[PDB]
Design an enzyme around this catalytic site. Structure first.
Site: not given
Ligand SMILES: C#Cc1cn([C@@H]2O[C@H](CO)[C@@H](O)[C@@H]2F)c(=O)[nH]c1=O
Ligand SMILES: C#Cc1cn([C@@H]2O[C@H](CO)[C@@H](O)[C@@H]2F)c(=O)[nH]c1=O
Lengths: 313, 306
Positions: A38, A56
């Site tokens: 990632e 988020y």
């Protein structure tokens, strides 16, 4: 020609994907296998500032009613663009080196996630969470790169109860079980979508059937258990009740991209060594490809290591 | 041998005359794919064009931050490009190798690079998009198929101002700075294609930015000597360098043609017809490709054209 094995480990966050990938790579001698992580450094720094935290926080402000759906959508869409960029460039620079589907691989590349995670799955989940429009999700779909030969995708299985506990322990992340449900649902639909297409399924023929498990085997799923079901939404429907053609064409692209993929399901409900050995067994049935030039192998190796060095934690 | 196709993408800065000139250019073996205004105003989102110009205006007046403006511009650009991206993706498998009489001529109002490269780059110049987002769009530019003929415009700036003043789209605001930015970007685009075709290598010439073909300083590459893209020692991060490699791959195989807009509408039409003799045609991949392409084109026109 020498052959190449590409394996994309994908699925909802918090399953153990990243650990499993590192363990598998640790088995191989240094350069018979390379890790493509990632791109955390891109997400946190190079691409923008703390993109994961931004995602988020935005969802949380939406949930709390402190921002509107529209404001949440523009922030989410722009952040999803950032999330996907390194996946898109990597795929684009790898593409010319990849030959036809093809005796051990001269090189094995293990990816943490495929381009469809940021270009399809996460947007689709955010749509379900009310923080992205389905039109925007379909714009991302339309930009999914052509699916390279020998695209082996490994998705995860894991009981929701265990997954929740795992997430509650093992960023900028906030604990959101609703998002977890959506992303689990989306990846389940994805597995079914590939299997539906491989069994000859035609979404245009089955569209009228809409009104609201493992893969690469088993019977043809109902269209309502594939990703196509998400896109019967009022925004996308013309007065006559059909999809606008522009959206229907995005679904055609979705079918084209997913249908040639090779899906495998890995059981994450076990120890890290267990997941590794399970993944190792799965690779035997995975599709290799030729590379287009002899020096493609070291070139690819260098790309992967350069990427990992610059963007992995 | 399969029948032949000619794809023509009419592109360049807006407000030169691109939508009237081609309107005139049309009627059976030629389809006009107009700008997807209806997608921009209704289907994809509500009045995307107004959204774009209002946001830049608010940034200019200091009513919102560079940051707020960028997220807005970025998602808006996603909406703008969508019909161009789906169309390319559905057309792609129908396109054969290079190939005389064309069985079908497709005239597009703009190519995917307008929304995936040029407009984002101009907004970057306007301070309303980050250069990382620009390179994200670049990374997603579809591979350049054979027979990609792109027509760009030439028009002196003052004449362009006059034209633009009469060609404001719904929600558009007259912005000479955006006009200048977008003209500069398309000028750089033309230079970049020529630089690449004449064998220019950006990685070899990159050193020249920090002091026979164009100088790299007169190509699109100069825009990406942006400090956001650079490590503490001044080098491009590899991930950004790779997007430049992709940019180079995509543009070098495009075929660019220049249309002088500084003339009458029917003159522009004639000039476009004159340009077609140099354009490259392709075969299609199946016998039924032609009727299918024709259907796609007309359906797009009907559903999304204004
Ligand atoms: C790829 C990817 C993505 C990862 N993520 C998130 O990134 C975090 C680490 O993968 C996790 O919280 C979640 F997976 C997104 O929100 N969107 C994406 O597109
Ligand atoms: C394609 C395209 C785009 C058009 N536009 C605008 O839309 C109008 C095009 O006619 C014009 O006002 C301007 F060119 C963008 O702002 N961004 C794009 O990507």
């Amino acid at each position: 020609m020498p052959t190449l094995l590409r394996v994309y480990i994908d699925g909802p966050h918090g399953m153990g994907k990243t650990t499993t990938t590192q363990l598998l790579v640790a088995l191989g001698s240094r350069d018979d296998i390379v890790y493509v992580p990632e791109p955390m450094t891109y997400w946190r720094v190079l691409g923008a500032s703390e993109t994961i935290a931004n995602i988020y926080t935005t969802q949380h402000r939406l949930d709390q009613g402190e921002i509107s759906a529209g404001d949440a959508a523009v922030v989410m869409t722009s952040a999803q663009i950032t999330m996907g960029m390194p996946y898109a460039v990597t795929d684009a620079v790898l593409a010319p080196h990849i030959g036809g589907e093809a005796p051990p691989p001269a090189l094995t590349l293990i990816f943490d996630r495929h381009p469809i995670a940021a270009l399809l799955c996460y947007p689709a989940a955010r749509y379900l969470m009310g923080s992205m429009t389905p039109q925007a999700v379909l714009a991302f779909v339309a930009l999914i790169p052509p699916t390279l030969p020998g695209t082996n995708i490994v998705l995860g299985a894991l009981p929701e109860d265990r997954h929740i506990d795992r997430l509650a322990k093992r960023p900028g992340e906030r604990l959101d079980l609703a998002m977890l449900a959506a992303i689990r649902r989306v990846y389940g639909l994805l597995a079914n979508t590939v299997r539906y297409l491989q069994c000859g399924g035609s979404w245009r023929e089955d569209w009228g059937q809409l009104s609201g498990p493992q893969s690469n085997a088993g019977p043809r799923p109902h269209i309502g258990d594939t990703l196509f079901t998400l896109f019967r939404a009022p925004e996308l429907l013309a007065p006559n009740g059909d999809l606008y053609n522009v959206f229907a064409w995005a679904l055609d692209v979705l079918a084209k991209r997913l249908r040639s993929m090779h899906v495998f399901i890995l059981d994450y409900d076990q120890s890290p060594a267990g997941c590794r050995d399970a993944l190792l067994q799965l690779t035997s049935g995975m599709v290799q490809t030729h590379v287009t030039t002899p020096g493609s192998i070291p070139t690819i190796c260098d790309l992967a290591r350069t990427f990992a060095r610059e963007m992995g934690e």
